[PDB]
Design a protein around this ligand. Sequence first.
Ligand SMILES: Nc1ncnc2c1ncn2[C@@H]1O[C@H](COP(=O)(O)OP(=O)(O)OP(O)(O)=S)[C@@H](O)[C@H]1O
Ligand SMILES: Nc1ncnc2c1ncn2[C@@H]1O[C@H](COP(=O)(O)OP(=O)(O)O)[C@@H](O)[C@H]1O
Ligand SMILES: Nc1ncnc2c1ncn2[C@@H]1O[C@H](COP(=O)(O)OP(=O)(O)O)[C@@H](O)[C@H]1O
Ligand SMILES: Nc1ncnc2c1ncn2[C@@H]1O[C@H](COP(=O)(O)OP(=O)(O)O)[C@@H](O)[C@H]1O
Lengths: 571, 581, 97, 96
Amino acid sequence: LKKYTIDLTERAEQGKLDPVIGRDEEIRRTIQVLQRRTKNNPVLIGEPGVGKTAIVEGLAQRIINGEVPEGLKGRRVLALDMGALVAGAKYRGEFEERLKGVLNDLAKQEGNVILFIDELHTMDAGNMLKPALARGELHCVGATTLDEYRQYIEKDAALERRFQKVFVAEPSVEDTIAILRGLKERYELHHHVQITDPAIVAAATLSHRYIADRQLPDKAIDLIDEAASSIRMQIDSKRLLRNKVTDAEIAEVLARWTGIPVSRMMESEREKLLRMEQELHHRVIGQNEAVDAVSNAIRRSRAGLADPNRPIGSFLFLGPTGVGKTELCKALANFMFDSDEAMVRIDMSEFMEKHSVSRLVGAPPGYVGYEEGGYLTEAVRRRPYSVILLDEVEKAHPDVFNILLQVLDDGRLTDGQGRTVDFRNTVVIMTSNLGSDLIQERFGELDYAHMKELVLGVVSHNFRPEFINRIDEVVVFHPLGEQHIASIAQIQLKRLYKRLEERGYEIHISDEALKLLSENGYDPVYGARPLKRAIQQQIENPLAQQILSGELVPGKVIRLEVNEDRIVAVQ
Amino acid sequence: LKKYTIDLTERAEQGKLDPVIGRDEEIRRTIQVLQRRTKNNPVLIGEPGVGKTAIVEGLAQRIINGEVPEGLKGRRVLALDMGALVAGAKYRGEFEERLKGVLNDLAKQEGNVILFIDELHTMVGAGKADGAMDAGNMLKPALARGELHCVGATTLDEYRQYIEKDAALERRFQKVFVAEPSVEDTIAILRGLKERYELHHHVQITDPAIVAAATLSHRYIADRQLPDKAIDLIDEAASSIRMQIDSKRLLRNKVTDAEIAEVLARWTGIPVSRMMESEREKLLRMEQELHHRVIGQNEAVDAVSNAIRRSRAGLADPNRPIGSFLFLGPTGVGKTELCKALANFMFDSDEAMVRIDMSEFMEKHSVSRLVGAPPGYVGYEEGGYLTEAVRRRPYSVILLDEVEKAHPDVFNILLQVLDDGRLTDGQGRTVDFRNTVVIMTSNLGSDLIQERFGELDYAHMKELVLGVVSHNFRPEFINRIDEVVVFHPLGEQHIASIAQIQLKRLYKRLEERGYEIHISDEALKLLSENGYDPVYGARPLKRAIQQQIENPLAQQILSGELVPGKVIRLEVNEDRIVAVQ
Amino acid sequence: DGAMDAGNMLKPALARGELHCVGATTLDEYRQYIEKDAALERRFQKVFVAEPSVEDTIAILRGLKERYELHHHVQITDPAIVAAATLSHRYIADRQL
Amino acid sequence: LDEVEKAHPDVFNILLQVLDDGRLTDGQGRTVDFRNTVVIMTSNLGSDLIQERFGELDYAHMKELVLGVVSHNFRPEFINRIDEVVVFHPLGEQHI
Ligand SMILES: Nc1ncnc2c1ncn2[C@@H]1O[C@H](COP(=O)(O)OP(=O)(O)OP(O)(O)=S)[C@@H](O)[C@H]1O
Ligand SMILES: Nc1ncnc2c1ncn2[C@@H]1O[C@H](COP(=O)(O)OP(=O)(O)O)[C@@H](O)[C@H]1O
Ligand SMILES: Nc1ncnc2c1ncn2[C@@H]1O[C@H](COP(=O)(O)OP(=O)(O)O)[C@@H](O)[C@H]1O
Ligand SMILES: Nc1ncnc2c1ncn2[C@@H]1O[C@H](COP(=O)(O)OP(=O)(O)O)[C@@H](O)[C@H]1O
């Protein structure tokens, strides 16, 4: 009288119920599937929350209270017994006599009571229950993932005659909100535990902004119970306690593997004075042309106002290439993602094949290579975070020109196989390499508001008037002078400093000594690409010549001399 | 034997088997094979959901009820499962002791047992690990000696690449082809099976919901086979109504075709559900509902709305698409816009218009991009641009844009879609255009269409343009077109009515932001000077919002007097327009 | 035949309720050796904990050096501690920090 | 990696991870560090372009001439991850 008897009258006697809130059009689906006789086995597929707990607690609520009479109620079904199957059985084959005895002797009353079985994926998933499922015995409620469903339950053929994929879509933030609405039946009457409104949402907002590889509600019910365990054990660690529940309880639990505090995890209405001066302006004091996209074009995007089907956050940003684009697309990702993952560069410069059809926005059939294709074909299926560049589109023959008009408008959203692409959180920096190549020489009297109307007015509409008729905001990047790269040639040398103090050499360099490099440094054609090899050929390959020779001993700082026709820093 | 093989014959004595209706030529041919001396092994070759598992359940019901010959009288139909034989077979020859345990129990039965191996292809290469196969190589002597009576039931392409590759096992089975029943042959299937679903659901199922469970399944569900979806639909509908009596004559239990097409609209997306909607309001106003978003073009809508009424009355050719149109005429007149309207009428989504631009098919090598590459060539398993798109949406308006810019050898690809509604892919699969509307815009006579529209009233643009310059020299393509449609160019009467739905669909959301604008009547001809074009058409009107109305807000930010919240006007002056707060 | 249940026997303390577990073991050996036993990993939920850092294992090495200075009778110098954590992290790849 | 231009272009995506990070994923999912190897790729893409170098090409413009022929064969993300593209001159009479 122990194993195969579960009485569901007890569930209101002990309060053993965790109520489901949010899923009703995805659980009444698993009562539509279950009520059939062909394919009457719902297997619940996806992220958690249901798992044979929504149909069993959402079943006694409509019978015992008494709005409907007794001539209609009577759908009293039962639930899973799984615990004592493998445990307590010793032999080979005498384990099997318990599983055949649990299904055959529930037929003592000619089908008076029916039964569900839960969580069938393991193999008990079609080795000992397969005649028990094919004989039309009783119907069960499965629960798999999506990939473990196509491991076991769909490349079979005799099992999908009864099972069918029931997918649940990714849930709200209000999943654990009502978990702590009812559960004060157990918390305040005997322990007086309060958890405030900004403390339930705090452990649940971690999905669309913080980390998006993991599901929400597994990360919500566990990071509240650890934050609520504060009082009874920190009083046993051998004005007294904040009884006002704030963001502090979750932050001790959440930030014990990151290192970033509360201060930028709840970016809010007044927090936008605090999110101006954190990481963008300590690595470099500057790069304040692109701060406009987070100041005036941010009000209609992050307050529930992001309309994806017309560009509102698309602030246009121009310049040359290799000159500061790729760092800011990483440093704005460093300002957002707390790390480095934005690797995007698109140029239409030096490739002449018929493969420029797939680099647009995807390949229609008749091609080779859909797995990579173009770069933007793969940059949403990898992860939805990428900052799209557009360079050097102005050179090919004019049959290829006007295909840039189709994506920027509200005509069709242009995905590839049925799942979405990014329309809301992308700043597009493009590159203008028209006659701004002779202007890079001097930094005296450069135009900010004389540049784009009188220079561009007479040079654009001779060959093509359909390019700048839309695009008009032109402001230049930094002109390549002396001291603005003397900061940049210090950034690449200070990662040579840390490369060198690991072996005991601290090298200094003067304002005179690093503009010795500037005669062999930058290129107006490539940007700041020949800066790094100029560090190798001028100092770093002569430096390793002297570290190995032993004439630069660790400990003594060395200075330079001006000398004969090859310029190296010797004693 | 009793550990693996489900006994179908004692599952028929309890009444647990589905009543099998019909199949008496495929059951008799099965018994004709099951009574052979050697190789008495039928294989019920069909397709998924044809009824080949419910043929042996109509053979096992037949042995008990006794309509079998003497010789099959009193047999047992055991349903061997090759998934329960490779179930826990970890070690060496744990599988082979399961067959040779089953095969030696079948020899103790001295031929009184029929063995139903459902899905024989799961037997080809079962416990195969070491080398030589172990399931259809252990049965191979007792299959050829006429010893174990093996009713197989596989599908035809699972027979083709599993059982036909073992040519020594392919001969031990006799193909009893189970063709799927027709739409009238599955009503009698479902008329007798309806009571087995009435007793399970406690739900009354009318034969109106059964005569329409099969005509709507066959017409609209094309991937499945017929007595699998027609019984899926009634089981889904009886479970949809089983909610309405549990929780919350007018609280009904009856299934009618209202509930059957509602489940099928919830499956595929075709809303032909009930005419108690505004469809009675819609079926004769089918020509003027297009006029809501196709301004003018009375010859255009009376060709497309009369052709898609011709098929909703069941009167059109079922070996031909719903409409085959040649929309030759000027650019920006209602050519591409009507097909969006025709998709937003028939399949009520203008995203169901498969636009194909035939300037991408300028040269002759680029014709296997539409139809698919042959076997062995690049882009074979990808498919074609037209055939795979119609396999995505078989219910779509195909727009073939500027077909005069195609190669002449792409109209040859487009002779079979028009004549028969078929196009074979490069992989030998045929796609079915019988539900699509193939509309083909062109600019081949547009120089002579535009000059004579206010001269030759409504019919002489059709005649006499064909033969001097236009398409008659390649004559096989003209007569396959359903209606050749010429487009009269737009005057000022239409572009005033065409330039009113620019923001009409976005109008129904953006009121509380601070925008509601009524019609201003002074800047009407500012857009009617660049937009109303006799030569280039009304397509520069879409740039006449991107160039005329939307400019001095989104770039005039930094000066510091114009801020949004005030609705702009336009008046006829030399203004460089102002905006007062 | 009837054996092979060293962990199965433990679970009659889970029938008691007395069975308790803090799984700290090899992760992929926790996957394929706890394969069929769902009654050993009932709701043991994914909470992060693994290898440290280079400056975290310098504190490991600085407190453990007295066991290695007295086993070998050498004087492990604090440059050798930092260089053992930085260079092994950089160069040795198959091993953990 | 000699005769590198004869490799299929799906081998350069595998080779790119070597020059990007120093890592390369084994087909069993093992990460192999290449940060202490010297990876040399021998190719002759600009073969008939260096045979005319003896007139007015002293390895500065000649480096950019062969990197025009090579950029038609290798991806631009691949060539920038190469530390040093080296152009070999043809051997004179005194070298033989
Ligand atoms: N002639 C028939 N009379 C009565 N019921 C039928 C008939 N044909 C099919 N059915 C029923 O319709 C369904 C058809 O499924 P099956 O009989 O298994 O066909 P099937 O060919 O085996 O499909 P698969 O893909 O191989 S499982 C079952 O529920 C049958 O009971
Ligand atoms: N919508 C929801 N309503 C109520 N509880 C939820 C909801 N979503 C998640 N949960 C909680 O999250 C936990 C998920 O755990 P579990 O159901 O074991 O995961 P799985 O479904 O993957 O087996 C449950 O304990 C449940 O209480
Ligand atoms: N703020 C900056 N100002 C100038 N140059 C920079 C800055 N940040 C990075 N760089 C330079 O950009 C170079 C990389 O540019 P390049 O290789 O031409 O383009 P990409 O990285 O997009 O391929 C680095 O060598 C670095 O010196
Ligand atoms: N007969 C018409 N009815 C309704 N709108 C029209 C008509 N003719 C032109 N238009 C408008 O003109 C625009 C034409 O744009 P576009 O599609 O670029 O031209 P085309 O159809 O020639 O390719 C459409 O957006 C449409 O709103």
